[PDB]
Ligand SMILES: *[C@@H]1O[C@H](CO[C@@H]2O[C@@H](C)[C@@H](O)[C@@H](O)[C@@H]2O)[C@@H](O[C@@H]2O[C@H](CO)[C@@H](O[C@@H]3O[C@H](CO)[C@@H](O)[C@H](O)[C@@H]3O)[C@H](O)[C@H]2NC(C)=O)[C@H](O)[C@H]1NC(C)=O
Ligand SMILES: C[C@H](CS)C(=O)N1CCC[C@H]1C(=O)O
Ligand SMILES: [Cl-]
């Protein structure tokens with residue numbers, strides 16, 4: 158009956174609030190202080206939430222979903238029918254929980270040491286080396302070292318992780334874990350749509366790639382860069398070469414039009430991690446969106462502890478499922494990179510606050526890409542020279558191309574990377590890639606999509622995917638690719654709503670109530686409606702589209718084409734088998 162389904166959903170919501178709140182606190186503690194005690198209590202509260210999930214999941218499966226009138230109730234019960242890991246038998250569930258914890262801990266505590274003495278952590282030590290070093294061998298030491306210590310140490314867990322996560326997926330009606338992850342977008346054409354979006358960004362990426370390769374040839378020498386081949390993976394200023402902004406100094410289009418060092422300016426003007434988040438909060442409220450509760454400032458970990466405690470430094474935002482307690486956990490360094498990250502995380506909080514009155518089962522983004530996009534949209538306006546000057550962090554066509562380049566190194570370079578991560582994982586989950594070929598197929602995709610090669614030939618036992626946080630942490634990655642496409646669509650739509658005219662990249666939406674209103678109406682929908690509805694609320698149309706991102710970067714595309722043609726660059730990497738001779 159229709160009445161029994163409504164009652165079930167009401168009972169689910171009530172009991173879920175209590176249990177999910179309890180789990181959130183226990184998960185917070187392990188992430189903020191990795192010990193043996195906190196690892197145990199997390200696993201005990203893990204079985205508690207699994208107990209609830211199993212109880213209500215089993216009940217939900219007794220309801221005939223498609224023979225149910227109300228669409229909101231129908232949708233909730235359908236989601237509760239997916240038990241996820243709680244579908245595993247007790248022994249497999251215990252093993253699976255143990256593996257995830259083991260992989261995450263291994264990643265978190267891995268260090269790279271000189272035999273002399275000094276041991277380096279990923280953050281900030283190895284990250285800093287990757288960002289600042291302009292010495293080929295020193296970059297190699299950190300690049301290889303991190304893979305040797307973190308990547309290699311994840312390999313022993315991964316095949317069993319794959320087995321158990323696929324099993325849980327099959328027990329919930331999917332064919333494998335990748336199938337289950339993709340289903341979050343509720344879009345049959347997902348794979349085709351993403352491929353077309355990626356293809357639309359080829360002219361821009363290939364031109365950026367060719368230009369950067371030429372600049373690296375200039376700095377690192379003709380003997381170490383093949384102008385028709387892939388770029389060695391350790392030279393892009395980032396451990397994973399996923400964003401390239403840290404090598405801006407090597408690639409600046411107009412060196413005679415330099416801008417202020419914002420990181421130096423932040424440190425100069427005494428910018429605290431707490432000020433960085435206060436500024437993000439101001440931007441949201443300027444748009445007419447919600448301020449963070451007083452409780453947020455009291456309970457968030459906005460900086461790496463000087464206590465010397467082992468933490469998960471990876472930046473994340475937290476919903477405690479009571480509509481009052483929201484937190485950010487971040488090991489914040491004072492720079493521009495983390496100022497954008499601060500807006501990114503505050504975007505998650507805004508989303509939490511906006512949909513807090515919905516049933517717990519519908520308290521997520523329209524799709525995972527939406528949750529990731531919100532903060533980045535505001536950060537786009539923040540990053541403009543106009544806005545950076547109003548923050549006293551900065552003091553012509555040449556400055557224009559320079560700024561666009563800086564943006565391109567982050568936003569454009571990230572496209573092929575964010576695309577490839579789950580292209581790899583989907584093929585691991587569906588069985589196309591076995592443990593014999595994990596690493597080799599990872600590098601095939603790094604070549605195919607990003608046009609990169611490893612500086613050092615990989616050996617048996619290498620598991621370079623393991624050296625990227627989201628792999629041992631089992632966090633789906635395709636959302637970041639969606640985010641980067643759609644955030645430019647949102648920027649474009651909000652800029653139109655704010656009455657901005659002229660080049661899209663010149664837009665700053667600060668204080669625009671019309672912009673804030675479009676985001677608010679979409680964000681309040683939570684997961685209650687198919688994502689194209691939220692897309693239509695923001696942009697006036699229902700599709701994902703790369704046209705906004707292309708429009709944003711159009712002046713840079715023109716510049717890159719002229720510059721690359723001038724030097725006769727080959728677009729792409731026709732000599733695709735080239736690897737460093739060293
Ligand atoms: C299908 O059912 C949904 C959800 O129903 C809700 O959940 C059920 C399990 C039961 O507990 C119901 O009692 C409960 O309503 C219905 O959506 C709901 O619609 C009403 C409007 O009729 C919304 O109420 C609003 O509440 C705000 C409070 O801030 C007021 O300002 C508004 O004026 C308005 O009264 C309610 O929020 C909404 N619930 C959800 C979860 O979206 C829906 O009406 C129903 N559809 C059909 C076709 O019957
Ligand atoms: C910090 C966020 C998690 S909320 C993240 O993992 N990001 C943000 C963009 C890409 C990806 C990454 O760091 O690899
Ligand atoms: Cl790698």
Ligand SMILES: [Cl-]
Nearest residue numbers: 525633635636
């Ligand atoms: Cl995702």
Ligand SMILES: [Zn+2]
Nearest residue numbers: 501505528529
């Ligand atoms: Zn995020």
